[PDB]
Design a binder for this molecule. Structure first.
Ligand SMILES: Cc1cc2nc3c(=O)[nH]c(=O)nc-3n(C[C@H](O)[C@H](O)[C@H](O)COP(=O)(O)O)c2cc1C
Ligand SMILES: Cc1cc2nc3c(=O)[nH]c(=O)nc-3n(C[C@H](O)[C@H](O)[C@H](O)COP(=O)(O)O)c2cc1C
Ligand SMILES: Cc1cc2nc3c(=O)[nH]c(=O)nc-3n(C[C@H](O)[C@H](O)[C@H](O)COP(=O)(O)O)c2cc1C
Ligand SMILES: Cc1cc2nc3c(=O)[nH]c(=O)nc-3n(C[C@H](O)[C@H](O)[C@H](O)COP(=O)(O)O)c2cc1C
Lengths: 353, 353, 353, 353
C-alpha cells in the first residue's frame, strides 16, 4: 500500500537502520519545529471555483524563467548514499525523468563532475562555504561541468542540535565520503594548505560569511544565483538587492533551529516585497501543501524528506513513484479547486483559518 | 441503545463488511476534512431566550416555496443498495413518511422510473454529467416521471482520492449496478454511440461542464434547479445569476478535497449575497448542528451519512428511527433556545466562539 | 486524601451506584457543555497585586443586601435523598453552619415545611411550575414557613436529553418521593382536579411560562425574587425590568442544552447592563473559578455538584468539609492576588487569555 | 544520555525519593500553572537574520551594571540540602565557576556566613520576612559578609496549596535545618522574644509586608535591591518608584497560585514602563526560552528547577554540566538567529504566534 508520501516514510523506517532513519527524520532539540512545519499548512483551507472547465490541465511552469514539467524540485540533501546506493544519481535521474531540476549538495556522496557526466537533466549545485578558496573551486567546477544554477545555503553557520544523533552517536557512514572534498591537496605547508587543511578537518563551516561575501560569490557565478535558508521578507529583499536572482525561504526542514518560524509565515510578504522568484521548502508532504504555497506566490517548492523516503524505501524507482504520486496529487488538486492552469493560482483559492 | 446518530453509526459498523463501511465513512486523503466538518460546529454556541412560551412548537417550513414537515432532506448518495437491499427505496419511503424530500443519485441502484412508480413522496433527482446526451436523457426521464426538483452536483470533476478504498481495492458491489445507465444503446457505430460508449466505459465524469453548460441545463429543466457542491458566496451568486433557483453549499461530506473549507464557513455570506434559498450539507449529525445552520440562514439541511447509518444498521425502519430522533432533537433544541417556530430562527440565538 | 472537590467526586463515584452517579455527573448529549463549563475558566488568569497587607482578610459579603459569611450558596438540586439519606437536610445544615443560604428544590425529597422546621438557617425556595395553581400553593407554603427568597428556574421548559440516564433506564429511586407534591388532593373531578391531576402525572413542566407569567409570580411573592437559568444580558435586564431583584446566570450545569454558552461568557455584560445583583453557577469547582466570577462582578456563586460530591461521599460532614476547603481556597486565593477584602475584587486582578 | 535539562530531570527523578522529587517538581493545585509556564514560550518563534558574521560571539552582559559571563543566575531555592549534600555550596560553586551570581534562600541549609566564607563568587541574598527584627538581622549579616545584592520575595504572603506535598505528608527533611534561624535567642520573655518566638514557631510569613515596609528595607540595605514575585508592569513600576534598583517578574515557578499569569506575559510592558532592569524566571528550560525573554528586554533570567535537576542528579558536577549545556545552547541559538552579541537582542528577532 504505497498511495502517498507517508506510506513511503513507513516503508523507509522499516528498511533503514535506526541510526540512519533518525539522521533522516530527526529535527532540532524538541522537534517542535518539524511539527510546526506540518501544522502550519492547516492555517489555510481551499475555496474551490466551481463550473470551471478543467478537462485540460497544465502543471507546466517557468522557474527562474526556464520551463519545467511542474513547480517542484528535489532539494539538496547530504549523504544520500547512506539512504540508498548511489543515492545522488538515483534522485537526479528520477528528477530528470520527471522533468524537474535536482540540486546536488556540497556534502554529496557523488562528485560534482561524476553526476554531470552521468545525468543530462537540469542540475543545480548547493554550496556550503567552509573555506573560501575551496568553495571557489567547487563553484568553478560546477560551472565548467554544466550546472545551471548555484544555491548558497546560509542557515548552517553552526550545526543544529539534533539530539537523536547525539543519542545514537551518529557517525558518517564508513562506506561513504564527502566526495567533493576529495583530491583537495595536502602535504603543502605555509598559510593556506595548513590554514585551509585545518578548516576542512573541522566539522564547522564558515560562520563569517556575510553580505560582502555574497557580493564576492555573485561576481564569481555568471548564471542564476539563489540564497537558501531565509526566514524574513527583509532578508529576501536584501538578497535581491545584493544581486541574487531569487531566494529559497526555508528553515532547513526543522533541523537547525527548533523554534524558527515556518517559511510559510513570510511567503506572501516576501513575494510582495521582493517582486522576484521566491521558492520554498520545509514541511511539504501533500500536494495540497504545495498548492497552498504556490497559491500564495511561491515560484516552486523543493522537496527534502518526501523524495528521500522514496529513495530509502525503493531506490530510484521509489523516487519516480513519489514524484508520480505528487504530480497526480497536484493535478487532482488543481482540478478540484477549479484552477486548470497551475500558473493561474492565486490567494483567491484560499481561506485563512 | 439507539439514542442518537452516533449509536447508529456504531451498529452500522458492526453489520457492514469493512470494505463497505469504509466506502461509506471514508473521506479524502488524511480525512482532516471530515473532522473539520464536525469541529466547525463548535465555533457557535447557543444563547437561549428565556420565558418564551414554547408549549406549541412548529418545525414546518417552506423549502423552495413548498411546505414540508421540517427543514431536512435525505441527500443524494450513490450505491445505497450496497448498504441495504433496495436501499434507495427504503430511504425514499422513510423520507416520505417523515414528510420530507428524497434526492435520488445518478449512480443509484434503483432507476429513476422504478422509484417514482413505487414512491409518491417528493422526489428530487441529482444529476452527474458524464455525457451530455446521456445526461439529457436522464433529465427528461426525471421530468416525465414526476420529479419536482433537479440538483446538479458540480464537485466531482475528478474522483476524490479516498485512500481507504485504495487500501481495500474497493470494487462496486457485484449484485449491484448503475441502473440509470441501463438500456443505454450499444452496437451502434459512428461519432456518438462510440464517442458516447467510450465516455460511459470511463470512471471519469465531464470535467468541462462550465457556466455555459449550466445555461444549457437551465433551459432543459422547467422546474426548480439547484446547484450542489458550492463553497463560496461568489459561486452561489453566479449560479443564481445564471438561472438557478437556489444552491446547496457542500464539500461532499469531506470525500473530494480534504482541505476544502466547511460550507458553514460561507453560509451567512452566501445567504446575504444571493438573497435566494441556500441549502447545506456536510458534517451534520446532531440537531444542534442543524439548528445552527438554520439560524445562520440555511433554508434546509441535507443528510448524507446520518440517515445512511440508519439504513445500513436497520434498513427502512432504521431510517425512520434516525429521522424520528433528529426531529425530536430539533424540536427539543427549539424549545430550549426559546424559538417555538423554526422559521423564526436567527443569528441572535448564537454566540461566535 | 480529600484535599479538593475532585477528591470528593472520586470518593462519591466509588460509593454511589453507577446509575445514581451518572444521574449526578451526567450532562446533555455529547457532554461538550460540562467540559466547556470547566474549560472557560482558563480564559482568565490572575495578575496579583504585591506588597499589599493581607494579614487581615474578610470573605464576608452582602448578597441581595443581606450579609453572609462568604459569596457562596448551595444551589437547588433535585433528589438529594438519592445521594445520601435526608440529603436535603444534610446540605441545609452544612450551609447554615457555614453561614450561607441553602436553596430547596421543588423536586426535593424533604418537604418545604419539614425543612423549615428542622433548620433555622437562611432558606431559599427554587420553584418549577408544572401547574399554576399548584405552584401558587408551594410559593405560599414557602412564604408562610419563613423562606426568605424565591428562585424561579426557567431553563427546563422541556427535559434535557441526558443519554447516560437513557442508557441506564434511570428511574426515580423507589425509597424516594417528590414530597412537595404530596397531599395534593385527588378524587376530585371537573376542570382542574382533573386538568391539574393530568399535569402532575406528566414528567413535563409548564413550557408556556412567559414574561406575563413572571409578572403574576412577582405580585404573589413579597420578598426577594430571582430568575435562574438566564444566558444573556438582555434576558437578565428584562427580568429586572419585570420586577426581579436579581438573576442567576446558568446553563443548569450543562444538563439541559449541550451547546449552550457558559454563563461566564455574559457575566460582565449582565453586570454592566442590569446594575442589579447577578449571581451565577455552572462549572465551579476551584476557589479560583469562584474568585474569577466575583472579580467580573458576580454577587455570589451557587454550588451544584461540588457540594453534592461531599454529600454523596460523606453525608453532612462531607458537605461541611467541602465548604471548609472551598472557603480556605477562596481565602488563600484572595491573599495571593493581594485583595484582602472579597468585596474589593475587580477585573483589574484578571488577564484575558 | 545527558544532552539537555529534561535529561537531568529524568535522572533526578530516578535518584530522589518520591517525596523529595514531588517537593521539587510540584506546583500549586491542578498544576495548570507550571504547564502554562512552559507553553507560553511557544507564543513566540524566531525570525533569524541571515548572512551576519557570527564567527565571534559574546554572551557577556551587564546585570545591574555589573558584568558577568552570561545573562543567567541560579535563583533562590529552599532546602537545597534535601536534594544533594551541601546543596547550597554545590550550586554556589558551580555558579561561580560559570561566572554568574548565586542567590541564597532565607530557608537555605547553609547559613549566610558559612557560604560567604566558603565561596568568593557573586553572592546574592533572598529575603523572606517572618519577623521584622529577625529579618533585619539577616539583612545586616548578609551585608557584613559581602553579599552584593538583596532580593525581597513578595509572593509567599501565605503558603501555596501544593497537593503533592499534602498527599505525601511532606515533612522538612530531618537531617536538614533552616540554618539562618539558628542561634536566634530563646529563653527571653516579654513582648518580642515571645512575640517573636511565636512568629518563628509558625510556618506563616509576614503577610502585612507592604509598600511602607519596602521603604523600611530600602533604607536598611545600601546596595542593589530587587523585588521578586511581581506579575504586572504597574507593580514593577511602583517598586522602582519606591527605591528598588530592579525587579524579578515571577510566579514562583507555578508553586504559589496555579492560575497566575506567566511573567512572560508582562515582560515587554514592564521593560517599557519601568526603564530599569527587569529580570525574570519561571518555566525556563531551553536556551531558546531564555533568548526569547532576553529579546523581549529581560536583563537576565534566573534558573530555578533547571539547575536543581543537575544538583539532584549529579551534585556540583551536575550543576556545572547543566550550566555548560545551557551556555552552549544560548550560544548556538545566538549564532542561528544571527545575533552574535547577546546584548544586541531585540524583539526584531521574534514572531508573535
Ligand atoms: C537528511 C537531510 C540532509 C540535508 N542536507 C542538506 C545539504 O547538504 N544542503 C542544504 O542546503 N540543505 C540540506 N538539507 C535541507 C533540505 O534542503 C531542505 O531544506 C529540507 O529537507 C526541507 O524540509 P522537508 O525535509 O520537510 O522537505 C537536508 C535535509 C535532510 C532531511
Ligand atoms: C456513501 C456516499 C455516497 C455519495 N454519493 C453521492 C452521489 O451519488 N451524488 C451527490 O451529489 N453526492 C453524493 N454524496 C455526497 C452527499 O450528497 C452529501 O454531500 C454528503 O454526504 C454530506 O455530508 P455528510 O455525509 O457528513 O452528511 C455521497 C456521500 C456518501 C457518504
Ligand atoms: C443532580 C442535579 C440535580 C439538579 N436539580 C435541580 C432542581 O431541582 N432545580 C434547579 O433549579 N436546578 C437544578 N439543578 C441545577 C443546579 O441548580 C445548578 O445550576 C448546576 O448544578 C450548576 O452547575 P455545577 O453542577 O457545575 O455546579 C441540578 C443539577 C444537578 C447536578
Ligand atoms: C524546590 C523549590 C524551592 C524554592 N524556594 C524558594 C525560596 O526559598 N525563595 C524564593 O525567593 N523563591 C523560591 N523558589 C522559587 C524560585 O526562586 C524560582 O522563582 C522558580 O523556581 C522559577 O521557576 P522554574 O522552577 O520553572 O525555573 C523555589 C522553587 C523550587 C522549585
Amino acid at each position: 500500500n504505497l498511495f502517498n508520501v507517508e506510506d513511503y516514510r513507513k516503508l523507509a523506517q522499516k528498511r533503514l537502520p535506526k541510526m540512519v532513519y533518525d539522521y533522516l527524520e530527526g529535527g532540532a532539540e524538541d522537534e517542535y519545529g518539524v511539527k510546526h512545519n506540518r501544522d502550519v499548512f492547516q492555517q489555510w483551507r481551499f475555496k474551490p471555483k466551481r463550473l470551471v472547465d478543467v478537462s485540460r490541465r497544465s502543471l507546466q511552469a517557468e522557474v527562474l524563467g526556464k520551463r519545467q514539467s511542474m513547480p517542484l524540485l528535489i532539494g539538496p540533501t547530504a549523504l544520500n548514499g547512506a539512504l540508498w546506493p548511489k543515492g545522488d544519481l538515483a534522485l537526479a535521474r528520477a528528477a530528470t525523468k520527471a522533468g524537474i531540476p535536482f540540486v546536488l549538495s556540497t556534502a554529496s556522496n557523488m562528485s560534482i563532475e561524476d553526476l554531470a557526466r552521468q545525468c543530462d537533466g537540469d542540475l543545480w549545485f548547493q554550496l556550503y562555504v567552509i573555506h573560501r578558496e575551496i568553495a571557489q573551486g567547487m563553484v568553478l567546477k560546477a560551472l565548467h561541468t554544466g550546472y545551471t544554477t548555484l544555491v548558497l545555503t546560509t542557515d548552517v553557520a553552526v550545526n543544529g542540535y539534533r539530539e537523536r544523533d547525539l543519542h545514537n552517536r551518529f557517525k558518517i557512514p564508513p562506506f561513504l565520503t564527502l566526495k567533493n572534498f576529495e583530491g583537495i591537496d595536502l602535504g603543502k605547508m605555509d598559510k593556506a594548505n595548513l590554514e585551509m587543511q585545518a578548516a576542512l578537518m573541522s566539522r564547522q563551516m564558515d560562520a563569517s560569511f556575510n553580505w560582502e561575501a555574497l557580493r564576492w560569490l555573485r561576481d564569481l557565478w555568471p548564471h542564476k544565483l539563489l540564497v537558501k535558508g531565509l526566514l524574513s521578507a527583509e532578508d529576501a529583499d536584501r538578497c535581491i538587492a545584493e544581486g541574487a536572482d531569487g531566494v529559497i525561504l526555508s528553515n532547513h526542514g526543522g533541523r537547525q533551529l527548533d523554534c524558527a518560524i515556518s517559511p510559510m509565515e513570510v511567503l506572501a510578504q516576501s513575494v510582495a516585497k521582493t517582486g522576484k522568484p521566491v521558492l520554498i521548502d520545509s514541511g511539504f508532504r501533500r500536494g495540497s501543501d504545495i498548492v497552498k504555497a504556490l497559491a500564495l506566490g511561491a515560484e516552486a517548492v523543493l522537496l527534502g524528506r518526501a523524495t528521500l523516503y522514496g529513495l530509502a524505501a525503493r531506490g530510484e524507482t521509489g523516487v519516480d513513484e513519489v514524484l508520480t504520486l505528487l504530480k497526480a496529487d497536484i493535478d487532482r488538486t488543481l482540478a478540484q479547486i477549479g484552477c486548470p492552469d497551475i500558473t493561474s493560482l492565486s490567494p483567491d483559492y484560499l481561506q485563512n483559518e
